[PDB]
RNA sequence: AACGAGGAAUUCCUAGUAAGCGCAAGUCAUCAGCUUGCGUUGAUUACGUCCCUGCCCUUUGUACACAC
């Protein structure tokens, strides 16, 4: 029978993803804080 | 007097997995295996008996218990037993927590224990691994019950020391033609053999001697090839 | 039940006419001379025909079969039924 | 419920018990009603099987 | 010679009608290709639980069969099979699909096994009904099985479920289609040839009961 | 293999039967039974299948010599099959016997 | 413990 | 394997059983006298017949 | 005057009006012969009255139906209902009561839903 | 680079109910990352039991026969 080997443990796209997630987090946070301020 | 098949060139039989539920095959399961992942802070680690004792005590379980070496050598010896080179068996890990890990007969285990443990932790988290092709998943994870995951017409036997000795060659050769075989093997180091009783139809012994789990697996596997003319 | 009018012809046939609308519904061909009488039992259940060929026929009428054919000796000419006791009488030729 | 669910062999054993009680006549008069109720209800429920059986000893004891 | 004549004049509507249709009205038949007489449930303890004394033209007579306890029993058998067949993950709510499916299956049945679809269906259901099951003991700490007996309505339900599920998983990963493999299932069960998912599971249940009585 | 499926419907592969791996030159239906289908393949062994049982050869039939490439049935006898082998020497078989050798 | 009926059964 | 046919007569009551299984009295179908008690798992009513493998062993409570 | 009788049929939210006249012996579900109601898995669930009572009872008269509302299955059930009810109503108005009563008996032998649609009311608990 | 129906645990469901499928409205609160109506297609399996899991109750007939 044929055999195989398993798997286990782009910087531009990586930093894009991390920074976009950061931005989304921040946008949600500033919504919520301004909203509490307003109330 | 009788001709030969149009081809006779060597051609490997296809791998057997849980999707095929017809052809007679061999089902080996490692049971009650001591396998779980904890966190130390910053990273996750699989338990091993010898190396994680302050936190093993903190959790409260037994060093003599939480040993996955047994699993490693058992799994290796099954995977490199001749019957798999004939391509006729597959294995199922019954986790101590309850998970089912079905081990496809196409994998090659990493032989050193640290690499093996890395594989086990990565599997426990991501629930799968792919190969060099990465076109079919290698180590799959599945639900209770094993009976739902076994070939339809099979037998339910657990290799227990107390059970009477029966010669594996004899019993396999008595087994019927489309009668696949599952064997529930207690991997746990030392204790009772009364866990799969509701699944099993009988307990079976192969000697008047106690055995190491891997050695018992090797013996039973050996009888299987001897019956199946390999 | 005041619905069904039975004719017995002079050529062995029986016709069952529904009476409210003058329509015809059913026919029976057993006898071959004139049919000297018909009765339907008080239960709508069975119906007996007596015929000059010295033959009586017992018919199931809720179904449509021939329960029986009883051939007597003499030609039969008269017939009268009694429903309270389910029996009839035949004035013969002899 | 109890007398209903009681199975047939146990019915037979119960009859032999009542025989022993009658021989222990004093208990009979100490508890006449309850014994009467038990007996009549049990036979009136298992009636057909009991009559179906064939045993001269049973005949004598029910006499 | 006794001969009723209820039909005085030829019956000819001014609407064109299929000749096969007037043959049907001469005698009710299922789908027009199959009767219901000489059609016995060959098994007592089932004879009055699989209602096959009732003729029906299509398997879709929508009824009140799940209000009392056993109106489910009184429902005809083919309707049961059709509905259990449409019971699927993406087949919920397509009964026209289910009925087309079963019609084509029975056509295959009649073509291959010449005798009679309905008779074969009944035979399959009876021969696949399990007959002695187990239930996990209460134990109070020791878990095992206890052997118990199974009532006829349960038997029929189990048989229908096993038949359709076996057919599905058979047709699941291949090129064949569910009609084809369900025909395989019914024919194989009618033989009782130990080589269908139905009979296999039935044997497992009965054998474990036998074992751990 | 043989594909057996109902006329006018190329969409349905009603059944696919896998006999011996050598190519099959001759396939036919019976004429006295309608559920018995005969085939032969270069394996020189002619196999009668019953279309109700798709898996095991209902009756294998040997005694041929070389490259069997014809057979036919006898109308009157629903048990008599003739095979034209390709070495000449027509064989006549009766199925209700063991059948290993021709009649 | 046990239930009635069964009690009398063993007794 | 000698199968047997039995007729469920009367479904017991107030009995300590498990959820979904019931004590029940069965009367042999070809022998209209013998009665046994068995455990049934599906739904059931009176007066309906059933198939048995173990034509002899009477039944018990299931705790 | 023309002998004339009308009835109704109602499944889920489907209306089926059915005129029944004495005439040339045909059957028309809304301007197209009953052989072409389209579902084709249910056309016999439409025929069911025709067949179950036999034809001449229809050979005498003309039945026109029109249907609306609901969908496929509901409209087929509605037509079968309206046909059957219309047949019995006509045979109890202008023809004999024996035909009436025995037709009603044949239908209620087979399946009562041809006569009284169930208004399948919701239920408490 | 990912993924082939989605593990372990826990949550809901008994009839036009489960689950499908599209049109429409936006009603002084709430709802556009949606919200509510209206249709059409329409099942599986208990309808039992207090054994387990909890919860309740009562543990004095008081009501007026005959009956336990």
Nearest chain B residue to E136, by CA? B198
Nucleotides of J under 7 A from a protein CB: 2-4, 7-9, 15-16, 18-20, 39-52
- How far apart, in whole angstroms, are the C-alpha atoms of residue H14 and residue B218? 55
Residue H20's domain spans which residues?
1-63
* CA of B175, C1' of J52: distance in angstroms: 40
**Å resolution of this model?**
4.6
Q: Residue E196 contacts by C-beta under 8 Å, 6 or more apart in sequence?
A: E166, E184, E185, E188, E189
* CA of B135, C1' of J4: distance in angstroms: 10
B145 preceded by cis ω (within 30°)?
Answer: yes
- As given in the structure block, the two tokens for residue B46 are 């699989």
Tell me whether residues B3 and F21 touch, CB distance under 8 A: no
I1-125 architecture in CATH? 2-Layer Sandwich (3.30)
Looking at the complex, report in whole angstroms how far the Cα of residue H5 sits from the nearest Cα belonging to chain D.
Answer: 17
* Exposed / middle / buried, residue B145 (Cβ in 10 Å: 0-12, 13-18, 19+): exposed
Q: Are there at least 3 beta-carbon pairs closer than 8 Å between C and A?
A: no
Q: Which residues pair with B93 in a beta bridge?
A: B30, B101
For chain B, the straight-line distance linking the first and the last C-alpha, in angstroms and rounded, comes to: 25
Total of domains in chain H: 1
CA separation, residue H57 to residues B35, H38, H60 (Å)? 46, 9, 10
Is the torsion defined by CA of E79, E82, E87, E90 positive or negative? Answer: negative
* CA of H9, C1' of J55: distance in angstroms: 35
Q: Which residues from chain H sit within 8 angstroms of residue D53, using beta carbons? A: 33
- How far apart, in whole angstroms, are the C-alpha atoms of residue F85 and residue F67? 6
- How far apart, in whole angstroms, are the C-alpha atoms of residue B109 and residue B138? 11
Q: For chain H, how many residues are written? A: 63
Task: State the CB neighbour count (10 A cutoff) for residue I28.
Answer: 15
Question: Residue E155: which of E42, E46, E41, E40 has the closest Cα?
Answer: E46
For chain C, the straight-line distance linking the first and the last C-alpha, in angstroms and rounded, comes to: 35
- CA I104, distance to chain mean position in Å, is 13
Question: Residue B102: which of B92, B87, B94 has the closest Cα?
Answer: B92
Residue C28 at interface with chain E, using a CB cutoff of 8 Å: yes
Looking at the complex, report in whole angstroms how far the Cα of residue A32 sits from the nearest Cα belonging to chain B.
Answer: 31
3-state secondary structure string across E113-150: CCCCHHHHHHHHHHHHCCCCEEEECCCCCCCCEEEEEC
- CA E150, distance to chain mean position in Å, is 19
Q: Which residues from chain E sit within 8 angstroms of residue H49, using beta carbons? A: 44-45, 152
3-state secondary structure string across chain I: CCCEEEEEEEECCEEEEEEEEECCCEEEECCCEHHHCCCCCCHHHHHHHHHHHCCHHHHCEEEEEEEEECCHHHHHHHHHHHHHHHHHHHHHHCCCHHHHHHHHHHHHHHCHHHCCCCCCCCCCC
- For chain E, list the domains and their CATH numbers: 8-213 (1.10.455.10)
Half-sphere exposure of E52 (CA within 13 A, CB side): 26
Nearest chain E residue to B197, by CA? E144
Question: Residue B185: which of B74, B65, B80, B69 has the closest Cα?
Answer: B74
Looking at the complex, report in whole angstroms how far the Cα of residue E118 sits from the nearest Cα belonging to chain C.
Answer: 29
- As given in the structure block, the two tokens for residue I24 are 């040339």
3-state secondary structure string across chain E: CCCCCCCCCCCCCCCCCCHHHHHHHHCCCECCCECCCCCCCCCCCCCCCCECCCCCCCCCCCCCCCCCCCHHHHCEHHHHHHHHHHCCCCCCCCHHHHHHHHHHHHHHHHHHCCCCHHHHHHHHHHHHCCCCEEEECCCCCCCCEEEEECCHHHHHHHHHHHHHHHHHHHCCCCCCCHHHHHHHHHHHHHHCCCCCHHHHHHHHHHHHHHHCC
Question: Residue B108: which of B117, B100, B116, B98 has the closest Cα?
Answer: B116
Question: Residue I81: which of I41, I110, I48 has the closest Cα?
Answer: I48
Task: Report whether B193 belongs to an annotated binding site.
Answer: yes
Place of tokens 């099993």: B200
- As given in the structure block, the two tokens for residue C83 are 């429903």
> Which ranges in chain A belong to alpha helices (H)?
11-38
Task: Report whether B175 belongs to an annotated binding site.
Answer: no
Q: Which CATH number do you get for residue H35?
A: 2.40.50.140
Place of tokens 């064109």: E16
Q: Which residues from chain H sit within 8 angstroms of residue D1, using beta carbons? A: 12-15
- How far apart, in whole angstroms, are the C-alpha atoms of residue B200 and residue B158? 7
Tell me whether residues G4 and D6 touch, CB distance under 8 A: no
Question: Residue I37: which of I8, I75, I63 has the closest Cα?
Answer: I75
Task: Report whether B54 belongs to an annotated binding site.
Answer: no
- As given in the structure block, the two tokens for residue E172 are 């699941």
Q: For chain G, how many residues are written? A: 11
Q: Residue F80 contacts by C-beta under 8 Å, 6 or more apart in sequence?
A: F73, F74, F92, F93, F94, F95, F103
Write down which chains contact chain H via at least 3 CB pairs under 8 A: D, E, G
The experimental technique used to determine this model is cryo-EM
Q: Which residues pair with C49 in a beta bridge?
A: C38, C57
- CA B88, distance to chain mean position in Å, is 13
């Amino acid at each position: 029978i044929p055999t195989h080997a398993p798997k286990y443990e782009d910087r531009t796209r990586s930093e894009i993803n991390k920074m976009k997630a950061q931005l989304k987090k921040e946008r949600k946070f500033t919504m919520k804080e301004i909203r509490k301020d307003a109330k | 007097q009788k001709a030969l098949p149009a081809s006779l060139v060597p051609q490997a039989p296809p791998v057997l997995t849980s999707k095929d539920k017809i052809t007679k095959r061999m089902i080996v399961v490692l049971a009650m295996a001591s396998l779980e992942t904890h966190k130390i802070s910053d990273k996750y680690v699989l338990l091993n008996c010898d190396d994680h004792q302050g936190l093993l005590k903190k959790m409260g379980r037994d060093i003599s218990e939480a040993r996955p070496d047994i699993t490693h050598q058992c799994l290796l010896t099954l995977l490199d037993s001749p019957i798999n080179k004939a391509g006729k068996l597959q294995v199922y890990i019954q986790t101590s927590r309850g998970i089912l890990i079905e081990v496809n007969p196409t994998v090659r285990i990493p032989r050193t224990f640290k690499r093996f443990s890395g594989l086990m932790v990565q599997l426990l988290h991501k629930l799968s691994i792919r190969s060099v092709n990465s076109e079919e998943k290698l180590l799959k994870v599945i639900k209770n019950p094993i009976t739902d995951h076994l070939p339809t017409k099979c037998r339910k036997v657990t290799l227990s020391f107390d059970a009477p000795v029966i010669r594996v060659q004899d019993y396999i050769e008595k087994l019927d033609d489309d009668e696949s075989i599952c064997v529930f093997v207690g991997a746990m180091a030392r204790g009772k053999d009364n866990f799969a009783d509701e699944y099993v139809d009988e307990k079976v012994g192969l000697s008047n001697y106690p055995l190491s789990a891997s050695v018992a697996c090797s013996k039973f596997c050996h009888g299987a090839e001897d019956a199946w003319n390999i | 039940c005041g619905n069904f009018g039975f004719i017995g012809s002079s050529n062995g046939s029986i016709t069952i006419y529904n009476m409210q609308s003058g329509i015809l519904r059913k026919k029976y061909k057993l006898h071959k001379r004139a049919v000297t009488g018909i009765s339907l039992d008080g239960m709508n259940r069975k119906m007996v025909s007596c015929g000059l060929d010295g033959i009586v026929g017992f018919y199931d009428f809720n179904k449509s079969t021939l329960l029986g054919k009883l051939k007597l000796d003499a030609p039969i000419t008269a017939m009268v039924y009694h429903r309270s006791s389910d029996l009839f009488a035949l004035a013969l030729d002899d | 419920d109890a007398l209903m669910v009681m199975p047939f062999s146990y019915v037979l054993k119960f009859l032999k018990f009542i025989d022993t009680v009658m021989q222990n006549k004093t208990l009979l008069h100490s508890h006449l009603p309850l014994i009467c109720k038990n007996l009549f209800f049990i036979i009136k429920f298992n009636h057909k099987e009991l009559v179906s059986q064939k045993n001269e000893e049973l005949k004598l004891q029910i006499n | 010679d006794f001969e009723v004549v209820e039909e005085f004049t030829p019956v000819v509507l001014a609407t064109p009608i299929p000749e096969e249709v007037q043959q049907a009205q001469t005698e009710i038949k299922l789908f027009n290709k199959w009767s219901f007489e000489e059609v016995e449930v060959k098994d007592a303890s089932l004879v009055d639980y699989v209602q096959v004394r009732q003729p029906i033209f299509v398997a879709h007579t929508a009824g009140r069969y799940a209000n009392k306890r056993f109106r489910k029993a009184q429902c005809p058998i083919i309707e049961r099979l059709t509905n259990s067949l449409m019971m699927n993950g993406r087949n919920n709510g397509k009964k026209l699909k289910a009925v087309r499916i079963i019609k084509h299956t029975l056509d295959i049945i009649n073509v291959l096994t010449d005798q009679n679809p309905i008779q074969v269906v009944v035979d399959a259901i009876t021969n696949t009904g399990p007959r002695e099951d187990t239930t996990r003991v209460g134990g109070g700490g020791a878990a095992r099985r206890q052997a118990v007996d199974v009532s006829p309505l349960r038997r029929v339900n189990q048989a229908i479920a096993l038949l359709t599920i076996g057919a599905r998983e058979a047709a699941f990963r291949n090129i064949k289609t569910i009609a084809e493999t369900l025909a395989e299932e019914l024919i194989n069960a009618a033989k009782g040839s130990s080589t269908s998912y139905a009979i296999k599971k039935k044997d497992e249940l009965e054998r474990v009961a036998k074992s751990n009585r | 293999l043989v594909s057996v499926y109902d006329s006018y419907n190329p969409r349905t592969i009603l059944l696919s039967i896998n006999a011996s791996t050598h190519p099959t030159h001759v396939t036919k239906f019976h004429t006295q039974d309608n559920k018995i289908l005969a085939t032969a393949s270069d394996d020189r062994v002619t196999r009668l299948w019953d279309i109700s049982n798709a898996y095991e050869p209902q009756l294998e039939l040997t005694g041929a010599t070389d490259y069997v490439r014809t057979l036919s049935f006898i109308p009157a006898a629903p048990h008599l099959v003739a095979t034209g082998s390709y070495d000449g020497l027509i064989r006549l078989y009766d199925t209700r016997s063991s059948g290993s050798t021709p009649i | 413990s046990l239930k009635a009926g069964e009690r009398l059964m063993e007794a | 394997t000698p199968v047997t046919l039995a007729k469920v007569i009367k479904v017991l009551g107030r009995t300590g059983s498990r959820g979904g299984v019931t004590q029940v009295r069965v009367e042999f179908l070809e022998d209209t006298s013998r009665t046994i008690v068995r455990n049934v798992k599906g739904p059931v009513r009176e007066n309906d017949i059933l198939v048995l493998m173990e034509s002899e062993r009477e039944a018990r409570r299931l705790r | 005057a023309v002998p004339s009788v009308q009835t109704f049929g109602k499944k889920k939210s489907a209306t089926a009006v059915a005129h029944v006249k004495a005439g040339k012996g045909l059957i028309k579900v809304n301007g197209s012969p009953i052989t072409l109601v389209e579902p084709e898995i249910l056309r016999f669930k439409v025929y069911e009255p025709l067949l179950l009572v036999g034809l001449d009872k229809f050979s005498n008269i003309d039945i026109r139906v029109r249907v609306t509302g609901g969908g496929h299955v509901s409209q087929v059930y509605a037509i079968r209902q309206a046909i059957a009810k219309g047949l019995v109503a006509y045979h109890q108005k202008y023809v004999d009561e024996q035909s009436k009563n025995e037709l009603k008996k044949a239908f209620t032998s087979y399946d009562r839903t041809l006569l009284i649609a169930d208004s399948r009311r919701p239920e408490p608990k």
